[PDB]
Amino acid sequence: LFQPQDIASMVILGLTCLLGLLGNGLVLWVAGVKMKTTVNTVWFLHLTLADFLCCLSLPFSLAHLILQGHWPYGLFLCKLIPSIIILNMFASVFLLTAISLDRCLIVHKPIWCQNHRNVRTAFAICGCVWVVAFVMCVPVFVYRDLFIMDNRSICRYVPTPLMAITITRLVVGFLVPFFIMVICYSLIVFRMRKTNFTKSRNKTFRVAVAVVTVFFICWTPYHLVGVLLLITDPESSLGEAVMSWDHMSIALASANSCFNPFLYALLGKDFRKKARQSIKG
Amino acid sequence: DVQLVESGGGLVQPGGSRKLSCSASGFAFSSFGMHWVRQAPEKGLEWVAYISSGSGTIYYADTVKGRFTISKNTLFLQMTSLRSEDTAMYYCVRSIYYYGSSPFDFWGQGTTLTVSGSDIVMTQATSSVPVTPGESVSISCRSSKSLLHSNGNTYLYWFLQRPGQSPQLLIYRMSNLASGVPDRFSGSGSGTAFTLTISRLEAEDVGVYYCMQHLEYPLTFGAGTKLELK
Amino acid sequence: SAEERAALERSKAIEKNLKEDGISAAKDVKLLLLGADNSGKSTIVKQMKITGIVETHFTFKNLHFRLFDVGGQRSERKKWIHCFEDVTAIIFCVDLSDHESLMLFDSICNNKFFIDTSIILFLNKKDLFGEKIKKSPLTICFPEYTGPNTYEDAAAYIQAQFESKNRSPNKEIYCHMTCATDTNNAQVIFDAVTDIIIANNLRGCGLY
Amino acid sequence: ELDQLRQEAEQLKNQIRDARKACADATLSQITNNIDPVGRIQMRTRRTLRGHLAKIYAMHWGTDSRLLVSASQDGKLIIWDSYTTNKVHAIPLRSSWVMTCAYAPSGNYVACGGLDNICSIYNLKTREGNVRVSRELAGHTGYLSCCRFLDDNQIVTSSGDTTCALWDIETGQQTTTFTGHTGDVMSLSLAPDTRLFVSGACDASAKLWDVREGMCRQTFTGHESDINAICFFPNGNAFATGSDDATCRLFDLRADQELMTYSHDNIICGITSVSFSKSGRLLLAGYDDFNCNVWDALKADRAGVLAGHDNRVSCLGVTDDGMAVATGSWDSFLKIWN
Amino acid sequence: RRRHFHHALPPAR
Amino acid sequence: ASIAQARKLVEQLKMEANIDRIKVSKAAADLMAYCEAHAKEDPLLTPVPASENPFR
């Protein structure tokens, strides 16, 4: 009745939704009520808002997996829900990239970050990131259609525009963000390897390797499946395995959303104290 | 000290255009919302245009909208498609609005330009009043709507125009006395019936008294009561 | 909502002005000058150009520093020292030509408001210190200094004595030597301030 | 000589203590034991003033019970419209190190002093439209910690040179200087009649001066630490002094001694601000523990807590009609409670 | 088998 | 030098000791009576209804 990998994907999606909604809601409420929108916290707040939106949209995918299809919603939802999900996911990716860029900047360019790095500038950059995410995730909204063709709704979408969207998603969601993150954290480590970073370069190195490894583990299966499915025709050994592991790949990429508040917002000791204080309210 | 000197007046052919300039000095003009008020050669004051601090909001009259546009330390009233009904002595009025402020407190000397429904109408029953000095006089004003807002403020403004002089604010918000106005002036009313009371009338107090509402734009003026000396 | 709309417009205008002014004020680097009486605070603040608080501001390599000399406040420091909790660093100036400053450094370094702010320690009058050592041994002010009577070791011992007052791992004491005839004070302040800015930005981002 | 003078001073102090003891027949707690309590005074934040950007060090109400002036170390003294949370004025300051502010009873003037040793008087009703410094009172050797308006011309300032001074805003000169405190005078409260006033110094003592004759009438002791806030009872016959010893105390003018101490074991932070209610039944005290506690001024028991500030509350004040409480804090927010 | 999974494509992809 | 300061302290102590003191019972009763008389006019110890509340 069900595949073991499918049940694993279902349980991972449920765990991700349940834990991530609570964590992202806590972080968002703390940073939007009990804390000030300082220059350092703006990126965390934007990223956690994107992760919260992705986690809130996750139960739609969970129900779709449970129902094995059979879309019960209208055409406008078959147009907006897949667009909102992808917007939230890639906004989280690009905000991770922007956090890496800012962390490299507050180290390699400390003077410029004192005069020309304000809260307004942080909001401007985050808004530009959101704009890029919307521009990248408008094609799914354009190309979503609610067909039926059977006893149930068959909302789907090799085609050259499908190839284009999956390839640009691969490139600007994995290769550019992953390379930027690796370069920024490598440069932070290399700069800390000079002098006066005795207290750092040990917690910083661990944080950098942890966050890059989490990004890699969480996001690689999704893009790998997305590219190989277009590359490899169905009805094969590792086309059946690929279709089987598609759902687990999405599950891991979504669990990235629940991971992120712990790696970014909960990393701060002051934020830890604020969350502990606000846990009894 | 504070001064609003303005020019741009003279004979204009019908259908023409003219830009009236109001030069302000002696006060922080950047933080004052500037009005324009005109008197026809025989009629009373009429609201023309209003420009807010920072040019955020601009309001125009029914007979002014579209034709005129209101825009350092200089106030401009770009005035186009002049008709024979636009002839008047346009005044420059400063007004800053904060809690407890005194809008319309200063009026420019005014420049003369000659061209050869839902409004809260304010009616002054006594067009003219003969009066002798040393007694107590009274000027009345009515309104189409109640001027008492839900926040407890009535928005009746009393102005005194001495013969051959610019209007001077006397009572703002129907109860409060402007700075420099002697205590002999008092104002009272409720909702629709407004009465300006003058005790121990003096020679300089002789003039024409104008009743203005500020509950909603346009800022309709009263017909004016000529408290002529007798 | 007759003229309360215009009151709200004025409120929004001056709120925007407050936001712009706060953004502009955030760019400056706040520094606090502390030390003994006639210990060299006036000398450094005058050699870099420009009885209440005496604020001094200048620009050095695109950084706007704000030096707040509070030597004229001959009152209880505990009642107003909390005003400077947001300073980037505490510039401490010590005259080596003269224990009186050690207690003050201990008080200001273990202050509950100054556990995160780094202290920049200046040991001025190095040449005067050498002349004093030549005139009389340095064990007068430090009887426990059972060591050589040489300026090279005496300066290091005094620096270690002053720096021993640091107990918080999150705050760093930058110690520098000056001869009151050098223009290197500004460069030292700039270097320490860049380091402190990097550390504070990293700590705020949670990466430190 | 010196020994004889010291012996005479000790004898006078002992006589004062004995006379205060003789006047002590019963405590306030015993007398107010029979009356019913107020219960739980649950106040909820009605407004939040999100204008400032630094620590708010003082906040004074207008006499009309609607306008409020707030002073922060961001360099601004913003005047607030509590009914609509509108910014009516924003006054830039010459020195950003301001630790007091006052609002004139007439509403025309605002004072602002601090670490610059200068009390600055601002004219809100300038004919030019903008707020201008009508006077910069100077002459205190130490930082000005408080200033209260007697009227549009007179003003009394409390400074860190252990002296309070009475000024004339027209001549800009010290009409009368009050001496006798041996530590920083960190607080000041003027009587309802504005003919007497009290000061709270850092010598753990409070002194009551007469504005006209310029002499100390009574000295009130009992605190174990520096007094940070003082406030008269609305009857003007008593005052409350909140110190850094985590205890407020109530002192009577006529009894010349303390009646009640408002101390709780769970509280260890010092009081930053004290204020009564319109009826004097509640003593709302701000604490460094980030919250303001409401005290039953007659039963010496807490009636509620004004928690909701993310940092230490630096100033408290109830309106003239007692309709609200404003509590500024170091979190750069002023909250109206009701 | 595989076509059924293809036609049940998740909204996230 | 300090003789003047000591004399000033002695004079101030004498002036503060020359005042008239009442019993603490009378002062406490007066405070209680003031609180009771003006209790109805205190909008803080009884939550004023939202109809008459200017901050509702």
mmCIF file of C-alpha atoms in Angstrom, chain D residues 146 247 267 284:
data_model
loop_
_atom_site.group_PDB
_atom_site.id
_atom_site.type_symbol
_atom_site.label_atom_id
_atom_site.label_comp_id
_atom_site.label_asym_id
_atom_site.label_seq_id
_atom_site.Cartn_x
_atom_site.Cartn_y
_atom_site.Cartn_z
ATOM 1 C CA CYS D 146 16.797 66.882 38.266
ATOM 2 C CA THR D 247 13.343 49.482 49.428
ATOM 3 C CA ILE D 267 13.158 42.128 45.003
ATOM 4 C CA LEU D 284 4.050 52.844 41.703
#
